[PDB]
Amino acid sequence: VEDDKEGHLVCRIGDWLQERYEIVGNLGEGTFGKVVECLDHARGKSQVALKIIRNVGKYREAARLEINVLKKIKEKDKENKFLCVLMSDWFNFHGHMCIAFELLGKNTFEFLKENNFQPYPLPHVRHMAYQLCHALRFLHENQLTHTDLKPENILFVNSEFETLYNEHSCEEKSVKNTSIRVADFGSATFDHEHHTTIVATRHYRPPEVILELGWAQPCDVWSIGCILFEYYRGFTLFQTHENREHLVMMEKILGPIPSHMIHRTRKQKYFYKGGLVWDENSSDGRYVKENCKPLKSYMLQDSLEHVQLFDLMRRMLEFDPAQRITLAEALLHPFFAGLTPEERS
Numbered sequence: 001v002e003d004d005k006e007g008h009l010v011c012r013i014g015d016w017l018q019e020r021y022e023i024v025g026n027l028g029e030g031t032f033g034k035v036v037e038c039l040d041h042a043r044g045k046s047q048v049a050l051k052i053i054r055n056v057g058k059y060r061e062a063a064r065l066e067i068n069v070l071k072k073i074k075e076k077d078k079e080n081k082f083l084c085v086l087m088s089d090w091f092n093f094h095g096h097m098c099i100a101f102e103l104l105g106k107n108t109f110e111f112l113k114e115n116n117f118q119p120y121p122l123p124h125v126r127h128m129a130y131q132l133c134h135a136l137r138f139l140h141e142n143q144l145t146h147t148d149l150k151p152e153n154i155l156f157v158n159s160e161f162e163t164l165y166n167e168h169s170c171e172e173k174s175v176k177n178t179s180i181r182v183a184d185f186g187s188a189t190f191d192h193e194h195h196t197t198i199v200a201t202r203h204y205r206p207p208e209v210i211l212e213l214g215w216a217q218p219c220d221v222w223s224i225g226c227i228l229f230e231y232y233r234g235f236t237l238f239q240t241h242e243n244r245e246h247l248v249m250m251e252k253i254l255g256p257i258p259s260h261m262i263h264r265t266r267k268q269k270y271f272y273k274g275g276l277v278w279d280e281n282s283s284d285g286r287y288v289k290e291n292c293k294p295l296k297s298y299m300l301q302d303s304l305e306h307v308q309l310f311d312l313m314r315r316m317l318e319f320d321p322a323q324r325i326t327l328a329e330a331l332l333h334p335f336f337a338g339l340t341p342e343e344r345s
Contacts, residue, residue, distance in 0.1 A: 072144070129228050136149075136182070147189055211264075228309070
């Protein structure tokens with residue numbers, strides 16, 4: 001075996017590792033390494049996703065911590081019922097940390113994109129919501145915060161779809177089975193561990209992160225609220241790439257930022273005399289004026305189930321993380337009364 005000059009293991013479809021794993025496909029990659037589909041010939045050629053981390057110290061050490069998280073999840077979920085992706089193996093292959101997991105279907109972002117960003121139906125949003133709440137409540141009870149929840153990291157167990165229509169327009173598609181798993185625990189942080197200051201992907205990042213006020217489990221709750229909005233409408237709640245504009249959007253959509261948070265933040269440059277600095281009649285001003293309205297305005301129906309969805313989402317999107325709904329509380333929200341018995345377990 002050998003590495004390339006970037007520290008990737010030099011490998012191709014056709015190659016083996018551990019006299020066990022046969023590489024049969026590529027699943028994706030990034031600056032961390034690569035993920036390949038393999039057949040596990042010690043487990044009857046079952047399919048796995050194998051993450052092969054680069055032979056670079058910072059990525060190796062990060063992967064060690066990822067493995068520790070995945071071990072805890074496995075230790076605590078013996079019936080495999082909390083819907084976190086299941087690690088089947090890990091090893092150090094010539095300095096490359098390798099982590100083997102269950103091979104699942106398309107992620108919920110990919111599926112939305114393939115559906116031309118037409119949203120998921122409400123019962124689908126509801127079942128996925130319930131599942132996210134259940135999975136993360138489990139994580140949260142084990143002193144863990146994911147920190148990078150986003151539709152790309154929520155995977156369908158099976159993403160086979162049914163066609164509703166196919167007019168000679170884009171094909172309107174619905175997933176047949178809305179069972180999901182939470183993936184990518186590479187940023188997950190135990191309560192006692194060092195907390196990276198800026199966590200989450202932009203669109204799913206909460207105000208206490210932006211304002212550098214400290215964060216914990218409520219971070220994930222905010223992300224989930226953002227994700228549900230996106231599943232319900234097909235577009236992101238916060239389409240921005242800059243902190244001040246993001247905070248302004250939060251205020252336009254959700255109401256005023258609590259004064260105590262503004263007094264406490266080291267990010268004073270975004271404020272003046274307690275209010276966000278924002279020129280509302282500038283080009284960006286008009287755009288935020290045009291596109292960012294109060295949260296309830298985005299409802300598509302006035303019916304009870306929609307009203308309930310938006311109440312839960314508002315509670316998930318509370319500015320103050322200490323006021324934000326917990327996932328234990330969320331699981332008891334009336335929105336979930338509309339689940340079926342099959343869905344409800």
